[PDB]
Paper text:
Connexins are transmembrane proteins which assemble into hexameric hemichannels (HCs) at the cell surface allowing the exchange of small solutes (ions and molecules of molecular weight below ~1.5 kDa) between the cell cytoplasm and the extracellular environment. Two HCs at the surface of the neighboring cells can dock in a head-to-head fashion, forming gap junction channels (GJCs). The GJCs connect the cytoplasms of neighboring cells and ensure their electrochemical and metabolic coupling in a process called gap junction intercellular communication (GJIC). There are 21 connexin isoforms in humans, with distinct tissue distribution, channel properties and regulatory mechanisms.
Once we saw that Cx32 reacts so dramatically to 2-APB, with a substantial rearrangement of the N-terminus, we were convinced that the choice of 2-APB for our study was clearly favourable. The NTH, flexible in the apo- and MFQ-bound forms of the channel, changed to a conformation closely resembling the NTH conformation in the Cx32-apo HC structure. While binding of phospholipids to site A may stabilize the NTH in a closed conformation, the functional properties of the site M have not been investigated prior to this study. Our results suggest that drug binding to site A may affect NTH-mediated connexin pore gating.
Residue numbers in the entry:
A (entry chain D), B (entry chain C), C (entry chain A), D (entry chain E), E (entry chain G), F (entry chain F): 1 to 105, 128 to 218
């Protein structure tokens, strides 16, 4: 777990990444993973089991939970991290492949593919930010929700588990994601400026 | 966890694999594993425990779940990954065996066995895609299902847990599987073209 | 996790094993372990908790489960893998011991002990195949079973959890075990032929 | 897990850290992690499941738990450790980046960034100490709490799980945090004195 | 996980251990660990939760389980493995200490301490075998037990979970323990004979 | 996991530790960790969930468990191990720091700090032994306890889970702790005698 080994691993052995991309982006990425790990099973572990509705209708609990939580916040963030990390993984594999072929026997190609990688990383961050806004308007969760989907008769009151703690972690993850967007834009601008 | 070590591990130390097979196929394979890991115990963990039917008949819950879910999506994808990864494992073991015997003391054989390996990988992907269609027509799961198998009297209403979230992950896994099929076909065509 | 390291580990550093024993047997062994891992806690996790009987008799659930499942399929396969892997472990330890003593300071002995090891591996596979047939005639599990053991009054209906999914994995494990038996017989015949 | 390797890892390969920062701060940091690990799932595992209120009102349990525990102590300490560890992680990454660039081809910059890192570490410790006081006045938890939030009618009695054991671990974590604050202040003063 | 590394680890870097002690005892020790691992949480996981008694008396379930299972079989075997492994651990530490001191700057002492180690290993095996017989006469567990301890009124019927599967693993562990006793006696006799 | 590596790790790379401190204390420390690991989640896992009282009063179960178990035995032993291991960790870090500074560019200081470390280790052992006696007089746990704390009306009967198995592990941990105290006193006396 040598510091130089961890730095080499996270940097992806890329010769075009700048200081922000090799230090700040990696740290914020680690921060999001650690927050997600400590908050996934602990806070969102009983999201559905503890979800109850004030009714005697069989199946109203499950249908109301599905109505109000089409996809859990933890899974949404997990997908966001995987999708955001994919272009970095592709660049690392491409660099390793180039090292392999040159050992068996370019700089502009590496520069261009890195820039495209950062652009796609920024694009994925923006898309997931918009999707999160679309599914869950606002940032705070409420204790009581009004559910009227079939088979629930009329409108029933359903209660969410730990809405305040989930709100706190939602703010943390959203703030970290916003910082990643800002750093990605700065990285793109810095690369373009240095290219001239 | 050195990048060159991970690249060497995933490539299988094969001298015939092309850029797509050594980069894109490996990345998509990692993507499917990561999605499966984050979605196996979290989303499908309570598939049967949360499955309830609007009835007083003892045993109707278990029999209806078995009727509508002959095999869970997570287990189906787990088997697909194992079966798809098997020909790659066989090639890697064969390469290691050839290295062992040559150290103790061919290229066409390695080329042919690699091509057959890709063909079988494509075949397994296609078969599991068809099996998934056969067991679960369409891609979206429904909240309410009508179950009439014995001992359930007449027809009873049963409710599925997280049908929307399972639908989202179903689309992700199916899309990734389709990409793998396309890349495998491209790999076969590229190898045949380069063989001439 | 270098491919040559994994190959050396699985081969057991044996100079008498043939291509089938060093490649195909190891791959099928890995296949059985992976299938068992993905199917142990997921499919058979709730074998007893979800097992219910249509009765009010206290203790009828536990006694009926014990009657129909004297030992779970997962534990039976786990024991089979351990017992089948034991002679390979003994040979590997004996080879390491011979290396140790020769460093501190035979080929026929290694050949004979390897042949006996394969014979015992085949014997254990056959015995567990017969035991599985004896405890669970046929290959498919049924949704409903008729239980009449004390204290259950008369005959009661008990319901099994995921009988179809368990049937699928039973076929997979049985097919893999049959392949291992065939490969072991081929290994013995090939060694005897090469000995002359 | 060589002692010099662990020491190098925890020190962050920093040439400006003093004896207290390289020995005592690291030990107390390990102490907090170990206490948190043994007390997270064991003591706070059933914080919400075991939380019950003397009422028949559906949803009163969940709403009262959220009212009295906006964020669990374990998650609060987990966030504190992550935030406190972040400036150390940034310095370690910056040092590794400087090593990388100098290998590809300062002391005052490293000194200043280390001092700022310690100041921010102290600031985060103080902020979380104040937040803990704000959310949970005092240090001891009580067995019985009076909850009157909607939908609970009037005021209901709710009972906390393991309030004495949680009190013991609260004192341990608070004492360790206070020691970290004292050591951080001593580190800042010592660095300033040595700078002159 | 190199075979020579595993062999060196299990042998304890001892120059007096014979072939049986370095091969057969280690293999049987691994066998017991693997059987215990696969059978601890799976088979004995619900020993107390699934234990039920045909009564309405509060607390009769817990008191009857304690009466009939003073200590679980899994914990008894876990203690047996730890106690049996302790003298081997002591010898390994003593050998390492002797290597340390000689590097900083005997054979009869090593021989005698090894013989005493085997004697104590045999003694611990015998003691745990007798304790197991004392607590659980016979080898097979029964489905129904008669419990009459306070507060249970008169005599109540209590039902054990998976008595047949637990019986199977009891036979496996007892047989392996008996083999260890035989091998330990053979080791002692062989060492004494070779000493003359 | 080389024996010399494990010995070097446990010894802490200390040149003043004697044979007892480098062999017997380390072995007993490993013994306590292993016993704690096998007995933490298995035996004390359901300490509160299985704790029931013969009453209809809501909240009487939780309040009575807190009254009779202010802190669980497992957590008490976990804290004892951490506190006892801390002075050893401090000495190891101090030794590593001295190695670091001497590489960048004493024996009496190392001797004195080691002696103080052993004294504090003995002191922590004694304090936790006294605390355990204070909270839980005697060594054996009882099946039935009489609880009269509010809100429980009058006095209610509450039943403990696995009191006999917990008693067995209590004796094991207490005996091991007593051995550690004896060895620590012997270490202090031996060091003082050798100092003259
Ligand atoms: C600058 C930032 C974005 C760098 C992010 C680096 C991420 C994308 C890289 C760094 C090291 C990578 C890991 C390296 C090795 C493995 C083992 C493999 O079997 C699964 C994936 C996994 C676990 C990788 C996941 C992606 C990973 C964590
Ligand atoms: C190009 C793509 C398809 C390459 C896919 C590589 C897959 C098939 C290979 C790469 C490295 C392999 C792993 C290497 C080592 C082990 C350890 C063994 O005890 C279990 C199997 C396991 C975990 C292997 C599983 C298969 C594996 C993950
Ligand atoms: C050709 C086929 C049958 C080879 C099968 C190889 C099996 C039997 C061998 C290969 C490597 C071995 C592992 C090597 C090291 C250890 C660590 C030890 O503390 C527990 C057992 C365990 C985990 C072994 C189990 C058996 C094992 C998996
Ligand atoms: C003096 C004190 C404060 C030093 C504290 C050091 C902390 C901040 C450092 C030391 C080593 C670091 C670890 C090194 C490697 C990894 C792997 C990565 O994939 C996740 C983070 C993780 C697990 C790091 C977390 C932060 C860490 C534990
Ligand atoms: C011939 C037979 C009896 C040899 C048995 C060897 C046993 C006693 C030895 C071999 C290697 C040892 C392990 C080596 C290292 C560690 C790490 C330590 O932090 C906990 C104990 C643990 C996990 C040891 C437990 C005991 C162990 C498994
Ligand atoms: C003679 C006896 C008392 C020696 C006891 C040695 C104990 C105190 C030492 C030996 C090796 C140490 C471990 C070495 C490395 C790490 C990794 C770190 O991230 C967490 C702590 C942890 C896991 C240490 C805990 C304390 C430890 C187990």
């Amino acid at each position: 777990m040598n510091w130089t080994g961890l730095y080499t691993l996270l940097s992806g052995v890329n010769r075009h990444s700048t200081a922000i991309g090799r230090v700040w982006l990696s740290v914020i990425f680690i921060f999001r993973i650690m927050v997600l790990v400590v908050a996934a099973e602990s806070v969102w572990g009983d999201e559905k089991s503890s979800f109850i509705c004030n009714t005697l209708q069989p199946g109203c609990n499950s249908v109301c939970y599905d109505q109000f939580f089409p996809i859990s916040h933890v899974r949404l963030w997990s997908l966001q991290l995987i999708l955001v990390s994919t272009p970095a993984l592709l660049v690392a594999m491409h660099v390793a492949h180039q090292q392999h072929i040159e050992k068996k026997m370019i700089s502009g190609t590496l520069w261009w593919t890195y820039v495209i990688s950062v652009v796609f990383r920024l694009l994925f961050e923006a898309v997931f930010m918009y999707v999160f806004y679309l599914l869950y308007p606002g940032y705070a969760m409420v204790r009581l929700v009004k559910c009227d989907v079939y088979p629930c008769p009329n409108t029933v009151d359903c209660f969410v588990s730990r809405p305040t703690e989930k709100t706190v972690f939602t703010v943390f993850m959203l703030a970290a994601s916003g910082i990643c967007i800002i750093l990605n834009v700065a990285e793109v601008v810095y690369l373009i400026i240095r290219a001239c």
